[model samples]
Target: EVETFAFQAEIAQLMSLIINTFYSNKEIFLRELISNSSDALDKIRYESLTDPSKLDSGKELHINLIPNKQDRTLTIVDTGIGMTKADLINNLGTIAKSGTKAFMEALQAGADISMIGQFGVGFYSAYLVAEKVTVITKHNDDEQYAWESSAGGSFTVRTDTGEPMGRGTKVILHLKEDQTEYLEERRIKEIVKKHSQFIGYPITLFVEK
Candidate 1:
């Protein structure tokens, strides 16, 4: 029901390097993340054009920000394209094979290297404020799974048996001790407005009391 893999040595160390580099002014990390979610919404729609069954979930295309102070987790959830466990491995597990050192050069120069490549690099930015991240997703083609990691090394993919996921993905950033400001619902709203409104997906904030 579960599988685990180690981060490539290059990314594990470079992940620490980049996350440590941006800890000073890292509110942008939220923006960096949700844009990826927004894209997931778009991607599923496009895939539906080719194979209509992709839309079998019948859920609306949207994203939601739910920051839980009670559990200390920040969830960016979307009813859009979900991942197969194979995707959880390749898209989330294996990062780019070719381009690692080049991005390192750019980050050191203080150049904006946020959207470096395929999926994993941008996703790794989650570590800026998260000690652990859990990705629970359901795809039309496959069953559900939860992918978990801390990015210093190794990640796990496990069967997500906790809830019934109708469709798409839920990314929970278990906020680190020092990064509690992200769990503030009002504060994260500003960050979303600043970074995500332009993407044109209907975004909602479900504040946990």
Candidate 2:
């Protein structure tokens, strides 16, 4: 059975801000996502130091950026600590604490860009460039599941019967009509180097030769 939930009122407001208020640039989506992936990887690595079982075999902490020209899809995959069903609901479906309020005030006040990640609203930034977003994730404690949304204030989640992700998260972005520039290898690489090269985990961009 599939489960659907509307975004928390604050989350709904944040989505509107991300999609409509933040209009000057969209490349930051990659940076935010990559940074998030790195954080996940760090979490698992740290956990595994105390309990080795938390780490998956052959899945080194790494991130991948793949672009599909035909489908106009950009995929970001990471070998790290994935989220559970409840985690998805909390992380994507609702705003934690007063993050939404702070995010709104920050944006309106022209806050520094570096503060974006702290507010935990970077994930919504994907909607700035993607018409739809699909997340396939597997946590060591939970089965793989798929969470999807069009950034329309609600999202659906269901069990993933396909191949398991081992342990990590995969995010697929269906690029918007005017966001095709994200599919360019050169553009992706430049963005990574400029914003995420300092990430702890290795980030690989898959591009056709």
Candidate 3:
């Protein structure tokens, strides 16, 4: 799934702004990712109708969050359309590129900014809290791959050692000390409901035994 795409330079400023402003509420990171997950589930569901075997399990869709405080990592994983290397860069790296000034112009002109995701920028929000993020993803068309990054202007994408997730993605947030609140179960659930109650997929936390 790796494709060609040179990194964009303007993305640097966008990264600075994200790390500073849009990420004040670290808890909302889970919600944004979950909302993005729900949208992916819808994609598969619609495709499943045309191909009964679209889903390997052919089961109802759901999202699962497994938080492991022992490892100081909080994983918000989902059974959704996974991203490829091209997607890893094109989706998570490129922000405020073309149409960025127009987007700002519209907002300054009092236009609604409700559909930002329709234009992209949803996945890049992961950079908010995670000092390092590991994205293990499986696609409907290709083998799984793991993309790791610290938002250090570069990322590493390679085949993963983890078992195939069947279909979807797993984002592990290596939480910094200040972002520790994200590991609390109740706190995570509350934020989940607030921003992703309407995700259209059942989201659950996997209990570590």
Candidate 4:
């Protein structure tokens, strides 16, 4: 098997640029991440039909959102193929998979490269609105893990002691001072429909005030 590797400096810098610049709207973060979660759920479901062992005994591909007004926290939850510790780092820490090389190649080949979602940078849009993020996730392949970042510099991943609800992820965002608009139900729903009304999987929003 080919060995895994750490991201080089250029890749790290590229990630920073994309996170700090490309995202046009703070709310776009939700749609992108939910879309990704749906894709992950689709992945294992397709795998499990053929590989019974791959199936989680009781699981369904679904997304949930919880909004907490008291503390100004908004969380998006999903039941899907979650990430491993290494997967967390590689997916969150660098731009190795969809970096400058892809962009350069697109330019050279005269491709618009405007598709945008081809790169996994969608998740970083969370940083645009959240002062801090806490991602609680469980996978069929491994134990629950929480991946966190403040979008300051580095991130931390730790084993979760929380109860598991089969398989999936929950992204909790502690909103930034300027992003309070997202906490409004009408606003959030508008944002969701504007960007992801036709997304393939179920997306439900839960509010406990």
Q: Give the whole-model CA lDDT for all candidates, comma-separated.
A: 0.78, 0.85, 0.69, 0.69
- Compute each candidate's TM-score over C-alphas: 0.89, 0.93, 0.81, 0.79
Report how far off residue 12 is in candidate 4 (Å). 4.2
Instruction: Give the winner by lDDT: 2 or 3.
Output: 2
For candidate 2, write residues 11-119 as lDDT tens digits: 7877776777646667888999998899889989989999887775434889999999999999999988999988988855455548767877887798854466788
Which residue pairs come into collision in candidate 3? none
- Expressed as tens digits, the lDDT of each residue in 1-209 for candidate 4 is 11224444544454455446644455667777777778877877888888867665345667777888878888888777777776776644454445555654654576432333555555655766787888888777777787776654566778888777567788898987777888888887887888888877788877554
In candidate 4, the residue pairs with backbone N, CA or C atoms under 3 Å apart (3 or more residues apart, or in different chains) clash, namely none
Q: Which residue ranges in model 1 land beyond 4 Å of their true spot? A: 91-95, 112-120
Worst 10 residues of 2 by lDDT: 91-100
Which candidate number maximizes TM-score? 2
Error of 3 at 162 (Å): 2.2
> Candidate 1's error at 103, in angstroms?
1.7
lDDT of 1 at 38: 80
The predicted structure with the larger lDDT, 1 or 4, is 1
Give me the runs in candidate 4 sitting further than 4 Å from their true place.
Answer: 1-24, 91-97, 100-116
Model 2: clashing residue pairs? none
Residue 201 Cα positional deviation in candidate 2, in Å, after optimal superposition: 1.1
Tell me the lDDT of candidate 3: 0.69
